[PDB]
């Protein structure tokens, strides 16, 4: 079963096999007085691993590397952070100390700097305009437009039809929004429509927080977001 928030003590990381060579990582952390789960992705990249997003903080990210070493045994050589918040870049300094080359878009690196968050070393080119896609080893990176944040990226694994939506996509059980401090509530439905247009064959859809699903999470997120702007 996919692990749930109450099953992961803060500081522990679970790995979940989605497909051959594709895993999610699941961790937990406190935000504004409660503990939340958070998802990232791991994708086999030949003899190496590509990591999508930290495990939300330095302690969790160290535990992530240890679990990967224990369970998979291939080196994590590159990481991509899909936006500038701490559940995506928090732990970048641990990754770098461990020998991982860290990447994000120029906008994400800039916003992390402004926020006083950790800053990935390398800039991903070719993602500056809504609708842009670039290949990055075994995945495609896609900038759908502003949504949860103005820099948020999604990731697609063609070999397995896996769409990682990051924080732009909500789990089915989540019916209210927040944290939308950095969100663009007007653009978010449009950004989701771009994801749908570009990845219509996605079979597994992973939200930034919570249980995976299918393309129904896209329509579900639009409904939640619109309800939030309706009142």
Ligand X SMILES: Nc1nc(C(=O)O)c(CCc2cccs2)s1
Question: Given the rule CB under 6 A, which of 9-17, 45-53, 137-145, 204-212 is the region that contacts ligand X?
Answer: 204-212
Q: Outline where the chain has alpha helix (H).
A: 58-71, 86-89, 92-98, 106-115, 188-198, 216-229
Which of Zn ion, ligand X, none interacts with 174 (beta carbon under 5 to 8 A by kind)?
Answer: ligand X
The binding site for Zn ion (CB under 5 A) comprises: 85, 87, 167, 208
Tell me whether residue 25 is annotated as binding.
Answer: no
Q: State the binding string over 16-55 for ligand X (x if CB under 6 A, else -).
A: ---------------x----x-------------------
DSSP string, 30-53: EETTEEEEEEEEEEEETTEEEEES
- Please identify which residue in 209, 218, 220, 222 interacts with ligand X, judged by CB under 6 A: 209
SS3 209: coil
- Let me know if 198 is a catalytic residue: no
Q: State the binding string over 135-174 for ligand X (x if CB under 6 A, else -).
A: --------------------------------x------x
Nearer to ligand X by C-beta: 96 or 174? 174
- Let me know if 179 is a catalytic residue: yes
Distance separating alpha carbons of residues 179 and 156, to the nearest angstrom: 24
The 10 Å Cβ neighbour count of residue 8 is 19
Cβ atoms of 186 and 229 within 8 Å: the answer is yes
Cis before 32? omega within 30: no
List Cα–Cα distances, 64 to 24, 153, 177, in angstroms: 11, 21, 28
Residues lying near ligand X in the complex (CB under 6 A): 31, 36, 87, 167, 174, 179, 208-210
Known binding positions for Mg(2+): 12, 138, 171
Active centre residues (catalytic): 83, 85, 87, 148, 179
């Amino acid at each position: 079963e996919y692990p749930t928030v109450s099953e992961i003590p803060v500081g522990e990381v679970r790995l979940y096999q989605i497909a051959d060579g594709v895993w999610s990582h699941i961790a937990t952390q406190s935000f504004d007085g409660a503990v939340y789960p958070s998802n990232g992705l791991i994708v086999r990249d030949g003899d190496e691993l590509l990591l999508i997003d930290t495990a939300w903080g330095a302690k969790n990210t160290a535990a992530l590397l240890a679990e990967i070493e224990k369970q998979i045994g291939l080196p994590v050589t590159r990481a991509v952070s899909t936006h500038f918040h701490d559940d995506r870049v928090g732990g970048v300094d641990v990754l770098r100390a461990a020998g991982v080359a860290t990447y994000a878009s120029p906008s994400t690196r800039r916003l992390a700097e402004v926020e006083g968050n950790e800053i990935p070393t390398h800039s991903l080119e070719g993602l500056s305009s809504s609708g842009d896609a670039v290949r990055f080893g075994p995945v495609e990176l896609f900038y759908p437009g502003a949504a949860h944040s103005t820099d948020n990226l999604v990731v697609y694994v063609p070999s397995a039809s896996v769409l990682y939506g990051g924080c732009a996509i909500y789990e089915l059980s989540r019916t209210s929004a927040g944290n939308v401090a950095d969100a663009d509530l007007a653009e978010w439905p449009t950004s989701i429509e771009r994801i749908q247009q570009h990845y219509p064959e996605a079979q597994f859809v992973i939200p930034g927080h919570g249980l995976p699903g299918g393309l129904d999470l896209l329509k579900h997120t639009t409904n939640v977001v619109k309800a939030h702007t309706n009142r």
